[model samples]
Target: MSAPNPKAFPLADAALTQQILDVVQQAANLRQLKKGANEATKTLNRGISEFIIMAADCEPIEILLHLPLLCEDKNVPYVFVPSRVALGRACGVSRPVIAASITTNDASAIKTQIYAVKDKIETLLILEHHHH
Candidate 1:
């Protein structure tokens, strides 16, 4: 058999992805994560956004398509991961989540982890754009 498949897009590697997923799960436990487009938009409008994570495989990919524009308008960073199903798993939810927002937490126990994920997301975003 071939080597294990790599992340399908401009997302973090498996190790980093696992770490990010762990942070997402923890954030969910703390109620600091908003999973779904509506909730993420609310978080952005409320100025509670640390960053946004989107599922690349969203059906039609347009139902929640407005989010990227809103994220840019709000000056919030956003990244697209490969799968909604996997994202739901990361967020510790029983169903797929098309979008998600990790809100700001000044004293959050996972602040460093959040920042780390944010930094990588931003880097990937830049890289994606630079190639466009």
Candidate 2:
């Protein structure tokens, strides 16, 4: 695969990528996922997401690139890797974005795994800083 754009900050590693993809698929099956930038933005504004997963292969734009800041402002964990880098049935078309927000559901079966995925990304955010 090509290198993730430099702007794709806190990008997931191979290990993290696979696990995050699994979480997206689970969220999709449970109907707890919102695909595309508009819906991803909606989830953040509504404060209804567990975390956001954004793929890196798409063209960078004002909305997509600025999404990282929105996530930080919302304090939501996000992965700038997946589905487009490797699309699943859950991903549908690339939507010029491949951005997906895994919405939170109190009784959803994926609760525990979602937390683990967040933690793994949290760990990456920490580890990636050593690069600077």
Candidate 3:
């Protein structure tokens, strides 16, 4: 209903969120998605991740707080969706995923889609990164 967390910066709106989930679904099929903090960090560590998607509704949220920092350090685009549960379903799993990374594959069919979303996410940063 109302806002969930003030710190969940640049949270995607309903339209963008739906598009993100749709791409997550597509990326999963293309084997271009890394689900959860474990693999997401792995993607960053190995330098293969293109972007990161996290849940704004994560309980306490500190669980993967470090992820956003890492993404920023790595200069990767990161976003927070409103629901962990919705993200899980998008990833085609019964369990929720607090964080998910979309891997980079220059030759993949979804490459354009990935980059398109990245542009919007960065646009989100430009606007919200300003003073509250």
Candidate that would win on TM-score? 3
Number of the candidate with higher lDDT, 1 or 3: 3
Best of the two (1, 2) by lDDT = 1
In the predicted model 3, the residue pairs found to clash are none
True-vs-predicted CA distance for residue 84, candidate 3, Å: 0.5
TM-score-superior candidate, 1 or 3:
3
Instruction: Using TM-score as the measure, name the better of candidate 2 and candidate 3.
Output: 3
The true-structure Cα RMSD of candidate 2 reads 3.0
Model 1 bad stretches (over 4 Å): 1-16, 128-132
**Lowest-scoring 10 consecutive residues by lDDT in candidate 3?**
1-10
Candidate 2, residue 68: how far the Cα is off, in Å: 0.8
- The best candidate by lDDT is 3
- Give me the runs in candidate 3 sitting further than 4 Å from their true place: 1-3, 130-132
The C-alpha local distance difference test score for the whole of candidate 2 amounts to: 0.75
**Global lDDT scores for all candidate models:** 0.76, 0.75, 0.86
Quote model 1's TM-score. Answer: 0.82
Per-prediction TM-score:
0.82, 0.84, 0.92
